[PDB]
A paper describes a structure:
Transcription activator-like (TAL) effectors specifically bind to double stranded (ds) DNA through a central domain of tandem repeats. Each TAL effector (TALE) repeat comprises 33–35 amino acids and recognizes one specific DNA base through a highly variable residue at a fixed position in the repeat. We then present fifteen crystal structures of engineered dHax3 variants in complex with target DNA molecules, which elucidate the structural basis for the recognition of bases adenine (A) and guanine (G) by reported or uncharacterized TALE codes.
We then attempted to co-crystallize these proteins with a modified dHax3 box element whose 7th base is changed from A to G. Four complex structures were determined at high resolutions. Nevertheless, an independent study showed that Gln34 is highly specific for base G, but not for base A. Therefore, Gln34 may be a good code that can discriminate G from A. It was shown that His34 is a strong code for base G, but not for base A. The structures shown here provide the molecular basis for the distinctive recognition of G and A by His34. Notably, the newly determined structures reported in this manuscript show that His34 forms H-bond with base G, but not with base A, which consolidates the genetic observation that His34 is a strong and specific code for base G. The structures also suggest that Gln34 and Asn34 are both strong codes for base G. Gln34, highly specific for base G, was not reported before and should be further exploited. His34/Gln34 → G and Asp34 → C can be used as strong codes.
Residue numbers in the entry: 231 to 722
Write the structure that this text describes.
DNA sequence: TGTCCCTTTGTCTCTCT
DNA sequence: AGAGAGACAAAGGGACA
């Protein structure tokens, strides 16, 4: 008999009881835990199904699932019950910060290291606890913290980094490796290749930090001479997420793409400078002629789709869905491209296919309005939030469909929609803001934190924003969102 | 096996002007 | 607003006990 038979059965046993109180998990939560945390993690969640759910700790099931669904999730769950009170009272962290720290593989290691090192890091190394929390909140968090403690002085003094840079480098998976590689390679990359420490920090400030710095060091010569590329264009490929894989794939496919399809180097750099760049490039070489065949898409439209993170998923979903979206849903190829040319194009595309008839028939939007909402990063999220929240923003808060679509139609629209639904009453009813002023504030990228900052002022007034009327705060909030507000906060 | 750590890719959100 | 930067997570491999 296949070994896994027993454990698998154990899994289904324990996981049927978890559909019971007090977590009520929905199959797609039990799977998640099962896949990443394993059976020990499903069986830890059961064994601690009460201790975690209410007084003392009081975690949402969402928050229990987040802690459990990683390797060592059992250890994390045990450690969180032990240290969360210790960390909120002895160190002053929110429990949401403790959950953040715990929700990665080896979470236990992270938690115990924050417990052990946060004093020495804040006192003797000058870090804020929020910096310590960010460093901690990735896989290998424990490693990154011990490495920060050890290398912060040598990185700042011998190498000229600001502690902020050291923290930005540290705050990724493999933070330890990136830090160590930045130490070793910073002088080599600066003194031999004329890179600013700033550019070295940007290369290092990703996952595959170590990998990207070493691949830049090895390949900058081969790329800038025998491949007509600038130091700037190599830095950009290496620091935008593509890292090692993207740089090596730029070597391979730069001539193939150009020579066979007439793409400039700038178009190749842009396709490269993203997460999964290598994937986008390879998919572009593979799929371009299929798309552009028989007066299909123009090349430039392929370059566009491809030049966002997830470009490969976007290219393949267009290939698959262009026909049905145009035939069955009355969309132009131009529209399909626009939806696709954003991070998560694939998600937006699939969500338009699913939700366009619903949003038109049941909610009275136009296809154009649907395309507009879908045509931003996180399109899937904005579109699903529009469906959830349209009848509520309209009926309960008096907003027009037009106004909702407008809040919806930026990056973060989901966040902006959910914040408007929650903050409109206190803003209007308690502080005299008009619905239109509220809709205006939220109708930008960063609508959410801009609404929250406006509320932070009219709820617990900083004396530094006092000479500003509501109408002035509103104008500032529209113009530069939270950062503009915090900008004036620094004036008193 | 369970746990810890690292890398790559995909996706979502916010900033900076 | 478009480019750039930063956050959040899924999934796989190495390493080791
Ligand atoms: Mg594994």
């Amino acid at each position: 008999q296949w070994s896994g038979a027993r454990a698998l059965e154990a899994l289904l046993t324990v996981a049927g009881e978890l559909r019971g109180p007090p977590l009520q998990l929905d199959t797609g939560q039990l799977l998640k835990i099962a896949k990443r945390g394993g059976v020990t993690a499903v069986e830890a969640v059961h064994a601690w199904r009460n201790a975690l759910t209410g007084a003392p700790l009081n975690l949402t099931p969402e928050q229990v699932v987040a802690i459990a669904s990683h390797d060592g999730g059992k250890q994390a769950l045990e450690t969180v019950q032990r240290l969360l009170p210790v960390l909120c009272q002895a160190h002053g962290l929110t429990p949401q910060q403790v959950v953040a720290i715990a929700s990665h593989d080896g979470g236990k290691q992270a938690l115990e290291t924050v417990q052990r090192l946060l004093p020495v890091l804040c006192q003797a190394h000058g870090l804020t606890p929020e910096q310590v929390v960010a460093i901690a909140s990735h896989d290998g968090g424990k490693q990154a913290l011990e490495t920060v403690q050890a290398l912060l002085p040598v990185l700042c003094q011998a190498h000229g980094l600001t502690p902020e840079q050291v923290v930005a480098i540290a705050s990724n998976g493999g933070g330890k490796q990136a830090l160590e590689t930045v130490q070793r390679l910073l002088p080599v990359l600066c003194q031999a290749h004329g890179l600013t420490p700033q550019q070295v920090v940007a290369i290092a400030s990703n996952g595959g930090g170590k990998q990207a710095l070493e691949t830049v060091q090895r390949l900058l010569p081969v790329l800038c001479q025998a491949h007509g590329l600038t130091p700037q264009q190599v830095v950009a490929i290496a620091s935008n997420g593509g890292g090692k894989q993207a740089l090596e794939t730029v070597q391979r496919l730069l001539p193939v793409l150009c020579q066979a399809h007439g793409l400039t180097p700038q178009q190749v750099v842009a396709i490269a400078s993203n997460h999964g760049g290598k994937q986008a490039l390879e998919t572009v070489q593979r799929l371009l002629p299929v798309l552009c065949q028989a007066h299909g898409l123009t090349p430039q439209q392929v370059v566009a789709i491809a030049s966002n993170g997830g470009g490969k998923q976007a290219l393949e979903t267009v290939q698959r869905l262009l026909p049905v979206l145009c035939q069955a849903h009355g969309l132009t190829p131009q529209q399909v491209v626009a939806i696709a040319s954003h991070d998560g194009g694939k998600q937006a595309l699939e969500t338009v296919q699913r939700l366009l008839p619903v949003l038109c028939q049941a909610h009275g939007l136009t296809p154009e309005q649907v395309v507009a909402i879908a045509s931003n990063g996180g399109g899937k999220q904005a579109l699903e939030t529009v469906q959830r929240l349209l009848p509520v923003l309209c009926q309960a808060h008096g907003l027009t469909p037009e106004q909702v679509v407008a809040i919806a139609s930026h990056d973060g629209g989901k966040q902006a929609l959910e914040t408007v639904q929650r903050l409109l009453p206190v803003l209007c009813q308690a502080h005299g803001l008009t619905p239109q002023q509220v809709v205006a504030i939220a109708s930008n990228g960063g609508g959410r934190p801009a609404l929250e900052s406006i509320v932070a002022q009219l709820s617990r007034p900083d004396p530094a924003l006092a000479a500003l009327t509501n109408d002035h705060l509103v104008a500032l909030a529209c113009l530069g969102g939270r950062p503009a507000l915090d900008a004036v906060k620094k004036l008193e």
